[PDB]
Amino acid sequence: GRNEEIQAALRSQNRAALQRLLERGELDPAQRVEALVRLGHGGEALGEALGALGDGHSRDNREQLRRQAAEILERTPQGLQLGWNKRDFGGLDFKGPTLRAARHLGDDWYADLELGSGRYHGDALDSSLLGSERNARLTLRRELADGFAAATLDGSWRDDEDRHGLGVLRNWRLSSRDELEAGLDWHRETDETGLMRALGMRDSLRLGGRHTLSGRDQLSWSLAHNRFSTRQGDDLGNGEALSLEWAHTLFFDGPAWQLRGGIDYQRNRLENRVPDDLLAAHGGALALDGARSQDLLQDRYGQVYLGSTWRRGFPGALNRSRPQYTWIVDTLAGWQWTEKEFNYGIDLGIGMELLGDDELAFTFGYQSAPQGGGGDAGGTLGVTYSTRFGR
Amino acid sequence: CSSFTSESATPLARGAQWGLVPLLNYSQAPQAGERAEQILLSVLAEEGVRPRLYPAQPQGDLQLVDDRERQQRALDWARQQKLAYVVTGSVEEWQYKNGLDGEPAVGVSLQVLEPASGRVLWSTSGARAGWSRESLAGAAQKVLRELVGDLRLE
Amino acid sequence: CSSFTSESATPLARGAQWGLVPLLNYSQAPQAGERAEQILLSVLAEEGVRPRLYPAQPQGDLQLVDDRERQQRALDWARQQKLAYVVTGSVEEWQYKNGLDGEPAVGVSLQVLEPASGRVLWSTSGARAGWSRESLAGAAQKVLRELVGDLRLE
Amino acid sequence: CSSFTSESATPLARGAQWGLVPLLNYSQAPQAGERAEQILLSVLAEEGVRPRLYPAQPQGDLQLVDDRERQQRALDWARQQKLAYVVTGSVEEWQYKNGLDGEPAVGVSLQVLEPASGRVLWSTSGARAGWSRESLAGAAQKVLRELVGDLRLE
Amino acid sequence: CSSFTSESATPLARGAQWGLVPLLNYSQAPQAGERAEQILLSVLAEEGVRPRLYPAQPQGDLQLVDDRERQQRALDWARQQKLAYVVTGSVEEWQYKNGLDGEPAVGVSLQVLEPASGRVLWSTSGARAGWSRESLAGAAQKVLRELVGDLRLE
Amino acid sequence: CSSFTSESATPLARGAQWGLVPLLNYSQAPQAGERAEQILLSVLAEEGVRPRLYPAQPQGDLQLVDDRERQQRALDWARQQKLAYVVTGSVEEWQYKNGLDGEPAVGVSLQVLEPASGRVLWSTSGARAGWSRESLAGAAQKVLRELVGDLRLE
Amino acid sequence: CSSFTSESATPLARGAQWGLVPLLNYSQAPQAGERAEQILLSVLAEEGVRPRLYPAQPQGDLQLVDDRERQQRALDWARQQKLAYVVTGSVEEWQYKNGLDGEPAVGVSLQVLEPASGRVLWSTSGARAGWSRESLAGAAQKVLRELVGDLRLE
Amino acid sequence: CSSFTSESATPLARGAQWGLVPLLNYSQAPQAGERAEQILLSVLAEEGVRPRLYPAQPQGDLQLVDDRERQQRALDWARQQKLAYVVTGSVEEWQYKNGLDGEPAVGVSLQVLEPASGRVLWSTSGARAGWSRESLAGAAQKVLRELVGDLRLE
Amino acid sequence: CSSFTSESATPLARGAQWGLVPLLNYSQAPQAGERAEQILLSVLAEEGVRPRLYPAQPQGDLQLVDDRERQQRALDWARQQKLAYVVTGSVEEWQYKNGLDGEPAVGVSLQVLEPASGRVLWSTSGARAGWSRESLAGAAQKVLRELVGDLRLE
Amino acid sequence: CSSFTSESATPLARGAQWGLVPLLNYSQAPQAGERAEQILLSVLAEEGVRPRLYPAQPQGDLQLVDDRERQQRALDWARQQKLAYVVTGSVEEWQYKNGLDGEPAVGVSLQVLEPASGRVLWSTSGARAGWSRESLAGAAQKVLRELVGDLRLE
């Protein structure tokens, strides 16, 4: 037959056969979109999918087109988002508005702009010197035949000291079941501790991979070597970080139910003493008394956790991928053997479509033992309104 | 999201001899007129109206598919039996949309005619884009309830 | 999400000779009328009602013979056998939706007639769009239970 | 995104004998003219206008039948009947826009003609696309209401 | 995710001459009635019931022989053998979901008939949409176990 | 994830003349009954049962030959000899499931018949949805081992 | 991820006249039986068993020449030659898992028949779903090594 | 991922007059036997063996001619030439596995026969896969080198 | 991203008897020449040039009349009319490049000839790949405005 | 990312009566030989060589063109014209590699023949997979410049 050969070409990843079938215009719209995804053109895939989802075509073509468009929008959303976020790191938080925009600037280039202002309200910080933090991050992602390459330009202008960082990432796909990722970081934002987030940068060389051990099981690992310095360019200590996670899916949707279990370990060689300029006494912004080097960066950190997630799409995402509303219930139980403390956390969220092709999302997060919190509980609070670019 | 036309007509008598003529399926969903008629018989019964259904006839030819022909062939029937009122109408939309939400979209128009003269005494149109978690039959039932609900009966 | 019509008629009599006439299939799912018939036989039995089923009179080409005509033959049979009531109706929706949730969607109308005259003594329509984890037969059973559950019997 | 023309003509008289002639479907959606005619009859009734409907005579092969010719036959009918005004029009767009939005897009032109001369006494057109949560029938109803509402009947 | 109807009939006698005729396949899955019968024979054996199976009726053209025609030709055999009871049923759903999880969905009705008169003594319906890692046969086994387990045999 | 029925019958004698007759393939996987029998023969060999296999017979078009016909001839052959017991069964499911996981799903019924009378002495049904990295043949082997394991022999 | 049955039979003698007859291919993979035969030849030679091979003969028609027909002819040949044992078997699975980068899944049964009587002396089944980077031939070789490895030779 | 069988037979003599006959292609890849024969000829010469090739014949009707009978004709040629050893074998797998890595999978069985009697003097099977950045011909060459390398030559 | 040639010929008098003959469509978009001609007529009139349009040729065979031959016949007409100048051109590109941006790509060549001698007094080519949110008609308008603007009109 | 063979022959004479017979097209790109011929003619002129082109011959069936025989015929033409040298060659690869960022891959072999006897005086091969943002014609031009550049001429 002919349709049988088309299906065989689609299944076997015969790039030449897909190219021929696509040029000669003998594929259905869903088959065309599938071939476009297989051949590496994601933007043209999205365009052809969104331009064919109408009454003119037949049943199950509309279904496959809708599903493919939704999954592509999940991977590479197009739209604008306004929101306000509160992240408590434990005794220290960072509030402020955010603005995220993303779109395909051409068929093979994806742009992601994320602007955000904010302020630090923390007991251990002199927030007067740490004025309003204006953050702007541009990420140009180039799609490749066997993965993608991305370059990020993020900057954080502040009265204390401006930070200008650059990051390059290259993701490889060895097979449908294996992916590898290598990336270089230079003067980038941190999240290890609230103090490090507010007063620190990171130069890091990172390796990682994601492996599909079965249809419902995925294994993810990451190896990193990080160098930490203050925003003024004074060393805080280097180290290596290891992460490993196993995710088991019980239901893929309706709602999606996933169980995860993983282990995170970090070992760092801290400097003998924190730089004096950072201390509040010497015209610095570290209001913590004593200011032991562990507070900025822990020499040893470890945790093994089990988690369960129930979700309908992703509330707070740039594009809503489910009909008319989304929600997430994510729970994590952790055992920090380095701190002899059990970490419990829940992440809640809900989204709703207001005017059409949009989403007003509210997200809440709680975490009893944030890393570097020192016994103080962390959490997250956010509200976002997202609108989608597309027909 | 729904839209309904509100009529400025005189209220119609509750206690009366009502008929029920088949509806016109101007939507491209097959058999949607019959589903609308069944849900309309149920919805009218909720308001104390029990119309007399038109007796069906054999269909052995392809020319007996025009809904207008059947509707006239039933209007004359209503004339013979001397009914006071005759409920009919048309189905404008009967489908799930093809967007991300895929909500049910129903559009139905309802008419009440005088069988002898054939004059239109009532005419209302209702449309609804329901919830993505709502069924098509449920959306049609809601639209028909609001159309029959606003019907002025005394 | 579900919706049901609330009939405003008089209670019927449980202790009577109930018939069961085939249900019309206005949905596009094949043999959905038969599935509704079986689940309705099970659901009525749960409420102390045991209808007498309808004899074969085996039909010819199924796709050519009209559903309404088989139903009319069934009402004729019920008229000869001196049945008190006949439960019948139609199926409006019987399918899993094609959206991103794929939930079951069922819409059915239930009608109780007097076999001789044919007057509609009861008419309720129910619709449901269930959970993604729910089966089509389960949703149909739920809708039929609610319709029969609201049936007023004495 | 909606746009409506504003005519500069003198107003028409509500207290006159109106007619209703079929709308010309220049959109590629089949049977959109009849759907627009039903929603227009409902919308006119909201304004207090009760047009006399053309008589629907049978035609030949339904595949090849021109809309202008049927409209002309109905104009001669209205001219025979001494109708002061005749409401008619056309559909330029009747569809959901392609994409995940499921966006209805309706474009309708409304014309009022003096049957004797055939002269156009009124002519306005409207369009509406940018509302993804509503249905096609709802959008058509809103457009027709805006057109009829701007008719400024006196 | 399952639902079952509860019968309101008198308990039956375990120590009786049970039969077993074909189950009607109103689902779209081929040979679903035979699979359901095999799993039902296994399930009844769990409950201490060993029914006499209908004989293999020789047939040349299976298409001409309807499923419930076969059921009738088996009920006559049950009548000749003077069996006290006979287990009958139908398959309404036998399929995996058309989604990412492909959960099994099964719906089966079970009826116990009196072979001589043909009266229905028991009628229960059960439906299940199981877990993602579940077989169709396992879901059918669970449904049939729940149906047979509610017979309240003596 | 598996499911097995527990026969409530007396154990059968290991030290007897066993036979094996072909399984009935009600699954839509071609030649699944032969694979099931081939694995079942090895599984029975673990427990010390060595049934005599039915002889091969010539045929024409295997598609036109009913499975139950061959099973009946095999039962006739078993009755011709002094076989105390005959192992039989049927395959309900033999496939890799549909969905992103694609795990093996096997469902098999195991029955023991008395060749002289044809009476069923044992009847158990097993089903399994195995690990995604498990093979279909391995899952069938596990199911048949559990079914034969539950066939306690004294 | 593999599974193998463990026979309880008495050891066979390595110092005997062995034979090999073709393997039944109940898998739907073409020519899988011949591949299994070659790999079984290699695996048997590894253990010191050198079976004389059946004489091939081209098939006049593929449909007429069945698998079991050819196997019976080979058994007749082995009977003519007065061999002590005939090692044989069947292929139940020879395929990669559906999708991209699916692992190989091999299911093979191994039998040793007495050529004179034709009774089974040995019967083991093995199944394996291998690594994603593993070949079908390698998985079949591992399965056949384990099956032949467990074969008790003395 | 690779796997090889190790023969227990005695070593063969390099100095004798070796032959080479075409390989049996039980893989579905066209002309894989010829490619394997060419690469095997190259690999044997690396060790020091210089087999004489089997002379080809006119095509005529090779469709009727199967691999086994053609190999038997080659063996007749070999015995006519008085060759001590004949290298032969079969191809079980010759393909790129489905996936995004273009991974080659090769399965080759290598046999050495004695033309005087036809008995197998050596028989090994090798398989290779999982090397994504490797050519199919390279994998075949590596497997054949390993098999020819293990062939103990004095 | 646009590109235009700079013609070095002498200025041409604006106050003369201009003519317009059809453009040659070498782009694969049907009727691109007619659209370009309409837009060029609008653009020329904006600059004060009002060419006499060629007559509508009654072409019995549209396929027979090559655009070059139509242009030649129009040149013959222009010679018959004693026109001072004749404007023509060609369309090299008229399409949306699509992908995701859908930007319009328009390429046209403008020629002014002396009809008596047939010489080319003016020759210029322009190309534009406009913005993503641009229409094809707008891009063609911009290109033709640039080309006609570059004419050195007295 | 290219590779070129370096001839070991003696340089030829730039000043001589050269020819250019057509190139063989062993790639699957239609008319790649002609494109290579034009680019080679341009590249030779850059080096000072100005070959005499062969005369076009009448052509019948274009699908039956045998490049070898036509090249040979051009070689006789060169012989009758008394040309010292003839430049020829072949096109092995002329295509864009599949997928995203498909770079142009061009492979050309250049040969300088002696028409007096047909002896090959020069033979080199070049291949280039160019930059992703490179054209096929540009890659061919670069390959031919390298090939003709290394052609030592004195």
Numbering used by the authors:
A (entry chain M): 803 to 1193
B (entry chain C), C (entry chain D), D (entry chain B), E (entry chain E), F (entry chain F), G (entry chain G), ...: 19 to 172
Reported in the publication:
Here, we reveal the architecture of the outer membrane complex PelBC for Pel export, where the essential periplasmic ring of twelve lipoproteins PelC is mounted on top of the nanodisc-embedded β-barrel PelB. P. aeruginosa Pel is composed of α−1-4-linked N-acetyl-D-galactosamine residues, which are partially deacetylated in the periplasm, so the Pel exopolysaccharide acquires positive charge along the secretion pathway. The β-barrel of PelB is assumed to form a complex with PelC lipoproteins, a hallmark of the Pel system in Gram-negative bacteria.
In agreement with the prediction, the complex is composed of a single PelB barrel built of 16 antiparallel β-strands embedded in the lipid bilayer and a dodecameric ring of PelC lipoproteins mounted at the periplasmic side. At the periplasmic side of PelB, two TPR domains resolved from the residues Gly-803 and the intermediate helix (“stalk”) are located within the PelC ring, being docked at multiple lipoprotein subunits. However, the exit pore within the resolved PelB structure is occluded by the glycine-rich loop Plug-S with a bottleneck width of 4 Å. However, within the assembled complex those aspartates are buried at the PelB-PelC interface and build multiple contacts with the surface-exposed arginine residues of PelB, such as 905, 944, 1018, 1114, 1122, and 1190, thus playing rather a structural role. The anchor chains of individual PelC subunits are sandwiched between two Trp-149 residues, one from the same PelC, and one from a preceding subunit, a configuration that potentially facilitates docking of the lipoproteins at the membrane interface.
